[PDB]
Amino acid sequence: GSWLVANQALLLSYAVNIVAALAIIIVGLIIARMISNAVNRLMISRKIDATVADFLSALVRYGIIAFTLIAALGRVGVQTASVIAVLGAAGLAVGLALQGSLSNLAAGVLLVMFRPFRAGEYVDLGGVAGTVLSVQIFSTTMRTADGKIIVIPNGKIIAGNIINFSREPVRRNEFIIGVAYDSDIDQVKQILTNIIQSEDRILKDREMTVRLNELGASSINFVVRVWSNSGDLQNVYWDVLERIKREFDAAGISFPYPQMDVNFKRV
Amino acid sequence: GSWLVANQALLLSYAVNIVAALAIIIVGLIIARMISNAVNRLMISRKIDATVADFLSALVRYGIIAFTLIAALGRVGVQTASVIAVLGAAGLAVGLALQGSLSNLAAGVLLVMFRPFRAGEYVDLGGVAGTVLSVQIFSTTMRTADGKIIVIPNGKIIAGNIINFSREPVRRNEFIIGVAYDSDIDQVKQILTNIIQSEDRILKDREMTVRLNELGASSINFVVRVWSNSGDLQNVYWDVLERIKREFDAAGISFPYPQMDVNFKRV
Amino acid sequence: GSWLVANQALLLSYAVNIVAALAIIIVGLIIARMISNAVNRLMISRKIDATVADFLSALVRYGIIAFTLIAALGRVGVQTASVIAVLGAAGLAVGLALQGSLSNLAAGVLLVMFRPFRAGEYVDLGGVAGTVLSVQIFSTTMRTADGKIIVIPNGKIIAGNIINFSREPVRRNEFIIGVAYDSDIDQVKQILTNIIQSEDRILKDREMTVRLNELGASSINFVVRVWSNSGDLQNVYWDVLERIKREFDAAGISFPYPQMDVNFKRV
Amino acid sequence: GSWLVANQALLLSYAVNIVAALAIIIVGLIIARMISNAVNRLMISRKIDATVADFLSALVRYGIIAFTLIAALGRVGVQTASVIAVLGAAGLAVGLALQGSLSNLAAGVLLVMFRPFRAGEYVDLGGVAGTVLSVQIFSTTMRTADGKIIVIPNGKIIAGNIINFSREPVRRNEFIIGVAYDSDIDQVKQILTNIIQSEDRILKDREMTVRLNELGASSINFVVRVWSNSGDLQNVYWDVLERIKREFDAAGISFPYPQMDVNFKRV
Amino acid sequence: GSWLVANQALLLSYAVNIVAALAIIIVGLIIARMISNAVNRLMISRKIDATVADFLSALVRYGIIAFTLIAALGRVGVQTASVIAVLGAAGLAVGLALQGSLSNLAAGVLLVMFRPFRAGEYVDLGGVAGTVLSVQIFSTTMRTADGKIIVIPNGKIIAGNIINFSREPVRRNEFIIGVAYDSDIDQVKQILTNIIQSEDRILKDREMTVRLNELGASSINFVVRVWSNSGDLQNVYWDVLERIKREFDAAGISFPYPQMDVNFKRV
Amino acid sequence: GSWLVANQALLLSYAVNIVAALAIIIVGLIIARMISNAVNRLMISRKIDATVADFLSALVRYGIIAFTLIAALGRVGVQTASVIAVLGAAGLAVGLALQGSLSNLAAGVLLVMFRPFRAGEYVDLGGVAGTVLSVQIFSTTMRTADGKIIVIPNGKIIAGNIINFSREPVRRNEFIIGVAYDSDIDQVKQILTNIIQSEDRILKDREMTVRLNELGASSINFVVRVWSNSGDLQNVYWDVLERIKREFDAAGISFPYPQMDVNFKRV
Amino acid sequence: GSWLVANQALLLSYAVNIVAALAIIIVGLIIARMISNAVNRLMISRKIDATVADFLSALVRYGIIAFTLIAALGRVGVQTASVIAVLGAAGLAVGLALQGSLSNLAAGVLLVMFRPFRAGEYVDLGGVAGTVLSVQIFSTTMRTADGKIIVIPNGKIIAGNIINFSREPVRRNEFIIGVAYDSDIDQVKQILTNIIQSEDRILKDREMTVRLNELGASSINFVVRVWSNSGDLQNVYWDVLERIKREFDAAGISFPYPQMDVNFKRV
Ligand SMILES: CCCCCCCC/C=C\CCCCCCCC(=O)OC[C@H](COP(=O)(O)OCC[N+](C)(C)C)OC(=O)CCCCCCC/C=C\CCCCCCCC
Ligand SMILES: CCCCCCCC/C=C\CCCCCCCC(=O)OC[C@H](COP(=O)(O)OCC[N+](C)(C)C)OC(=O)CCCCCCC/C=C\CCCCCCCC
Ligand SMILES: CCCCCCCC/C=C\CCCCCCCC(=O)OC[C@H](COP(=O)(O)OCC[N+](C)(C)C)OC(=O)CCCCCCC/C=C\CCCCCCCC
* Cα–Cα distance measured from residue B186 to residue G200, given in angstroms and rounded to the nearest whole number: 48
Q: Would strands B162-164 and B122-124 be described as parallel, antiparallel, or unpaired?
A: antiparallel
Identify the H or E element spanning D23.
Answer: helix D11-44
Q: Is G68 in the pocket of ligand 3 (CB under 6 A)?
A: yes
Q: What is the DSSP string of B180-217?
A: -TTS-HHHHHHHHHHHHHH-TTB-SSS--EEEEEEE-S
What distance in Å separates residue A173's CA from the closest CA in chain G? 7
Q: Is the dihedral of CA E57, E63, E69, E75 positive or negative?
A: negative
- Output the CA torsion E195→E198→E199→E202 (10° steps): 90
* E48 CB-contact burial (10 Å; exposed 0-12 / middle 13-18 / buried 19+): middle
Against chain C, the chains showing at least 3 CB pairs within 8 Å are B, D
Q: Would strands G259-266 and A260-266 be described as parallel, antiparallel, or unpaired?
A: parallel
* Cα–Cα distance measured from residue D202 to residue D198, given in angstroms and rounded to the nearest whole number: 9
> Looking at beta carbons, which pairs linking F206-214 to residues 24 or more positions away fall under 8 Å?
F206/F170, F211/E235, F211/E238, F211/E242, F212/E238, F212/E241, F212/E242, F212/E245, F212/F185, F213/E238, F213/E241, F213/F176, F214/E241, F214/F176
Q: Is D266 on the interface with C (CB under 8 A)?
A: yes
For ligand 2, mutation pick of D64, D76, D80, D86 (most atoms within 8 Å of CB): D76
Same domain, G86 and G157: no
* Cα–Cα distance measured from residue F173 to residue E147, given in angstroms and rounded to the nearest whole number: 9
* Cα–Cα distance measured from residue G209 to residue G203, given in angstroms and rounded to the nearest whole number: 12
**Which CATH number does the domain housing residue E51 bear?**
1.10.287.1260
CB contact under 8 A, C264 and D264: yes
Q: Is D259 a member of any domain? A: no
Q: What angle do CA E177, E178, E182 make, to 5 degrees?
A: 130
CB contact under 8 A, A109 and G80: no
Whose CA is closest to atom 52 on ligand 2? Answer: D69
Cβ atoms of G97 and A99 closer than 8 Å = yes
* Distance from the first to the final alpha carbon of chain E: 124
D20 CA → ligand 2 middle, Å: 11
Cβ atoms of B94 and A88 closer than 8 Å = no
DSSP A252: T
What distance in Å separates residue C52's CA from the closest CA in chain B? 21
* Cα–Cα distance measured from residue A155 to residue E233, given in angstroms and rounded to the nearest whole number: 53
Q: Is A257 a member of any domain? A: no
Cβ atoms of B11 and B1 closer than 8 Å = no
Whose CA is closest to atom 31 on ligand 1? Answer: C77
Same domain, D175 and D151: no
Q: Which one, of D254, A263, D266, E265, lies nearest residue F262 by Cα?
A: A263
Q: Is the dihedral of CA B48, B54, B59, B64 positive or negative?
A: positive
Starting at the edge strand found earlier in the chain, the sheet holding G220-229 runs G170-179, G220-229, G209-215
* Distance from the first to the final alpha carbon of chain A: 124
- Label each residue of C154-212 as H, E or C: HHHHHCCCEEECCCCCEEEEEEEEEECCCCCHHHHHHHHHHHHHHCCCECCCCCCEEEE
* Cα–Cα distance measured from residue E158 to residue D153, given in angstroms and rounded to the nearest whole number: 7
Q: Is the dihedral of CA D103, D108, D112, D115 positive or negative?
A: positive
Decide which of F65, F87, F110 is a domain's last residue. Answer: F110
Q: Is F140 a member of any domain? A: yes
Cβ atoms of G180 and G243 closer than 8 Å = no
DSSP D183: S
Starting at the edge strand found earlier in the chain, the sheet holding E170-179 runs E170-179, E220-229, E209-215
- Cα distances (Å, whole numbers) of residue A258 to A176, B74, B263, D217, D239: 16, 86, 11, 21, 43
Q: Is B116 a member of any domain? A: no
Using CA coordinates, name the residue in chain C closest to D266.
C264
Q: Which residues of B157-181 are buried (b: 16+ CB within 10 A; e: fewer)?
A: bbbbbbbbbbbeeebbbebebebbb
Q: Would strands C122-124 and C162-164 be described as parallel, antiparallel, or unpaired?
A: antiparallel
Residue E82 half-sphere exposure toward CB, CA atoms < 13 A:
21
* Cα–Cα distance measured from residue D135 to residue G91, given in angstroms and rounded to the nearest whole number: 43
Closest ligand to the CA of F14: 3
Q: Which of D46, D65, D83 to mutate to test the interface with E (most CBs of E within 10 A)?
A: D83
E87 CA → ligand 2 middle, Å: 22
* Cα–Cα distance measured from residue C244 to residue C8, given in angstroms and rounded to the nearest whole number: 108
Q: Which one, of G16, E75, E72, lies nearest residue F10 by Cα?
A: G16
DSSP C257: P
Residue ranges of B 43-102 with Cβ closer than 8 A to chain A: 63, 66-67, 70-71, 73-75, 80-81, 83-85, 87-92, 94-96, 98-99, 101-102
Cβ atoms of F135 and F108 closer than 8 Å = yes
Cβ atoms of A118 and A164 closer than 8 Å = no
* Cα–Cα distance measured from residue A257 to residue A181, given in angstroms and rounded to the nearest whole number: 12
How many domains are contained in chain B? 3
CB contact under 8 A, C170 and B178: no
Q: Is C131 on the interface with D (CB under 8 A)?
A: no
Ramachandran region, residue G170 (left: φ > 0; alpha: ψ -120 to 50; beta: rest): beta
Q: What is the DSSP string of F162-205?
A: EEESSSSSEEEEEEEEEE-TTS-HHHHHHHHHHHHHH-TTB-SS
- Cα distances (Å, whole numbers) of residue E194 to E190, E200, E202, E208, E240: 6, 11, 12, 11, 11
* Cα–Cα distance measured from residue F140 to residue F119, given in angstroms and rounded to the nearest whole number: 10
Residue ranges of C 172-231 with Cβ closer than 8 A to chain D: 177-178, 218
* Cα–Cα distance measured from residue B172 to residue B223, given in angstroms and rounded to the nearest whole number: 12
For residue C266, count other CB atoms closer than 10 A to its CB: 9
Work out which ligand 3 atom sits closest to the CA atom of G67. 7
| Breaks in chain D (C–N > 2.5 Å) following residue | none
Q: Which of G82, G98, G157 to mutate to test the interface with A (most CBs of A within 10 A)?
A: G82
* Cα–Cα distance measured from residue G153 to residue G99, given in angstroms and rounded to the nearest whole number: 13
Cβ atoms of E160 and D156 closer than 8 Å = yes
* C161 CB-contact burial (10 Å; exposed 0-12 / middle 13-18 / buried 19+): buried
Q: Which one, of B134, A188, B54, E114, lies nearest residue G245 by Cα?
A: A188
Distance of CA C80 to the CA centre of its chain: 43
- Output the CA torsion C8→C12→C13→C19 (10° steps): 160
Identify the H or E element spanning F99.
Answer: helix F99-113
Return all residues near F12 (Cβ < 8 A) that are at least 6 apart.
E4, E8
* Cα–Cα distance measured from residue F24 to residue E80, given in angstroms and rounded to the nearest whole number: 11
* D28 CB-contact burial (10 Å; exposed 0-12 / middle 13-18 / buried 19+): buried
* Cα–Cα distance measured from residue C97 to residue D102, given in angstroms and rounded to the nearest whole number: 5
**Which residues in chain B are contacts of C163 at CB distance < 8 A?**
128, 148-150
The CA radius of gyration of chain D, in Å to the nearest whole number, is 37
Q: In chain A, which residue ranges form alpha helices assigned H by DSSP? A: 4-7, 11-44, 50-76, 81-97, 99-113, 154-158, 185-198, 233-251
CB contact under 8 A, A85 and B83: no
* Cα–Cα distance measured from residue G246 to residue G180, given in angstroms and rounded to the nearest whole number: 16
Q: Which one, of C130, C118, E171, lies nearest residue D167 by Cα?
A: C130
- Cα distances (Å, whole numbers) of residue A103 to A99, B161, D179: 6, 15, 57
* Cα–Cα distance measured from residue D47 to residue D182, given in angstroms and rounded to the nearest whole number: 72
**Which residues in chain B are contacts of A245 at CB distance < 8 A?**
185, 212, 215, 220
The CA radius of gyration of chain B, in Å to the nearest whole number, is 37
Q: What angle do CA G87, G91, G97 make, to 5 degrees?
A: 140
Same domain, E178 and E142: no
The CA radius of gyration of chain A, in Å to the nearest whole number, is 37
What number of residues does chain F have? 267
Looking at the partner chain, which of D12, D171, D185 has a beta carbon nearest the beta carbon of C245?
D185
* Cα–Cα distance measured from residue D131 to residue D128, given in angstroms and rounded to the nearest whole number: 10
Helix (H, G, I), strand (E, B) or coil at E201: coil
* Cα–Cα distance measured from residue B249 to residue C180, given in angstroms and rounded to the nearest whole number: 13
Looking at residue E195, its amino acid is I
- Output the CA torsion F104→F109→F114→F117 (10° steps): 50
CB contact under 8 A, F262 and G267: no
Q: Is the dihedral of CA G34, G39, G40, G42 positive or negative?
A: positive
CB contact under 8 A, E259 and D257: yes
Q: Which one, of E171, E172, E153, E169, lies nearest residue E121 by Cα?
A: E169
* Cα–Cα distance measured from residue A88 to residue A86, given in angstroms and rounded to the nearest whole number: 5
Same domain, G82 and G141: no
Cβ atoms of C17 and C75 closer than 8 Å = yes
Q: What is the DSSP string of B100-119?
A: HHHHHHHHHHHHHHS-S--T
Q: Is F21 in the pocket of ligand 3 (CB under 6 A)?
A: yes
- Cα distances (Å, whole numbers) of residue C211 to B230, C161, C177: 19, 31, 11
Same domain, B89 and B128: no
- Label each residue of chain G as H, E or C: CCCHHHHCCCHHHHHHHHHHHHHHHHHHHHHHHHHHHHHHHHHHCCCCCHHHHHHHHHHHHHHHHHHHHHHHHHHHCCCCHHHHHHHHHHHHHHHHHCHHHHHHHHHHHHHHHCCCCCCCCEEECCCCEEEEEEECCCEEEEEECCCCEEEEEHHHHHCCCEEECCCCCEEEEEEEEEECCCCCHHHHHHHHHHHHHHCCCECCCCCCEEEEEEECCCCEEEEEEEEEECCCHHHHHHHHHHHHHHHHHHHCCCCCCCEEEEEEEEC
Q: Which one, of E235, E240, E236, E233, lies nearest residue E192 by Cα?
A: E240
Method: cryo-EM
* Cα–Cα distance measured from residue D27 to residue D30, given in angstroms and rounded to the nearest whole number: 6
Same domain, B68 and B159: no
* Cα–Cα distance measured from residue A124 to residue A142, given in angstroms and rounded to the nearest whole number: 10
For ligand 2, mutation pick of E60, E67, E69 (most atoms within 8 Å of CB): E67
**Which CATH number does the domain housing residue C144 bear?**
2.30.30.60
For residue A137, count other CB atoms closer than 10 A to its CB: 17
* Cα–Cα distance measured from residue D161 to residue C160, given in angstroms and rounded to the nearest whole number: 13
| Breaks in chain E (C–N > 2.5 Å) following residue | none
Against chain D, the chains showing at least 3 CB pairs within 8 Å are C, E
Q: Bridge-partner residues for E261, per DSSP?
A: F263
Q: What angle do CA D127, D132, D134 make, to 5 degrees?
A: 130
Q: Is the dihedral of CA G34, G40, G42, G44 positive or negative?
A: negative
For residue D193, count other CB atoms closer than 10 A to its CB: 14
Return all residues near F263 (Cβ < 8 A) that are at least 6 apart.
D257, E259, E260, E261, E262, G265, G267
Against chain E, the chains showing at least 3 CB pairs within 8 Å are D, F
Cβ atoms of E88 and D89 closer than 8 Å = yes
Q: Is the dihedral of CA B211, B215, B221, B227 positive or negative?
A: negative
Cβ atoms of F140 and G145 closer than 8 Å = no
C72 CA → ligand 1 middle, Å: 7
* Cα–Cα distance measured from residue F158 to residue C2, given in angstroms and rounded to the nearest whole number: 68
Q: Is B266 a member of any domain? A: no
Closest ligand to the CA of F24: 3
Looking at residue F130, its amino acid is G
* Cα–Cα distance measured from residue D142 to residue D122, given in angstroms and rounded to the nearest whole number: 9
Same domain, D18 and D90: yes
**Which residues in chain B are contacts of A15 at CB distance < 8 A?**
none
Whose CA is closest to atom 24 on ligand 1? Answer: C77
Cβ atoms of C187 and C253 closer than 8 Å = yes
Same domain, F19 and F105: yes
Q: Bridge-partner residues for B124, per DSSP?
A: B129, B163
* Cα–Cα distance measured from residue F60 to residue F56, given in angstroms and rounded to the nearest whole number: 6
Helix (H, G, I), strand (E, B) or coil at A261: strand
Q: Is D53 in the pocket of ligand 2 (CB under 6 A)?
A: no
Against chain G, the chains showing at least 3 CB pairs within 8 Å are A, F
Same domain, E33 and E105: yes
* G137 CB-contact burial (10 Å; exposed 0-12 / middle 13-18 / buried 19+): middle
Same domain, C131 and C187: no
Closest ligand to the CA of D30: 1
Q: Which domain holds residue A209?
A: 170-251
Q: What are phi and psi of E248, to 5 degrees?
A: -75, -50
- Cα distances (Å, whole numbers) of residue G75 to A12, F66, F79, G15, G100: 20, 20, 7, 11, 38
* Distance from the first to the final alpha carbon of chain B: 124
Q: Is E65 in the pocket of ligand 2 (CB under 6 A)?
A: no
**Which residues in chain A are contacts of B178 at CB distance < 8 A?**
none
Closest ligand to the CA of C71: 1
Q: Which one, of G29, G21, G121, G17, lies nearest residue G66 by Cα?
A: G29
* Cα–Cα distance measured from residue B242 to residue B236, given in angstroms and rounded to the nearest whole number: 10
**Which CATH number does the domain housing residue B192 bear?**
3.30.70.100
Q: Is A4 on the interface with G (CB under 8 A)?
A: no
Helix (H, G, I), strand (E, B) or coil at C150: strand
Q: Is D115 a member of any domain? A: no
**Which residues in chain C are contacts of B260 at CB distance < 8 A?**
260-263
* Cα–Cα distance measured from residue C240 to residue C218, given in angstroms and rounded to the nearest whole number: 23
Same domain, D19 and D58: yes
**Which residues in chain D are contacts of E9 at CB distance < 8 A?**
4, 7-8
Contacts across the B-C interface (CB distance below 8 Å): 191
CB contact under 8 A, E155 and F159: yes
Q: What angle do CA D127, D130, D133 make, to 5 degrees?
A: 130
Closest ligand to the CA of G34: 3
**Which residues in chain C are contacts of B265 at CB distance < 8 A?**
267
* Cα–Cα distance measured from residue C152 to residue C159, given in angstroms and rounded to the nearest whole number: 12
G174 CA → ligand 3 middle, Å: 73
Q: Which one, of F160, F104, F163, lies nearest residue F135 by Cα?
A: F104
Residue D243 half-sphere exposure toward CB, CA atoms < 13 A:
17
> Looking at beta carbons, which pairs linking D55-62 to residues 24 or more positions away fall under 8 Å?
D56/E109, D60/D32, D60/D35, D60/D36, D61/D32, D61/D33, D61/D35, D61/D36
Same domain, F146 and F215: no
Q: Is A264 a member of any domain? A: no
Q: Which one, of A25, G49, D95, lies nearest residue E99 by Cα?
A: D95
Q: Is F263 a member of any domain? A: no
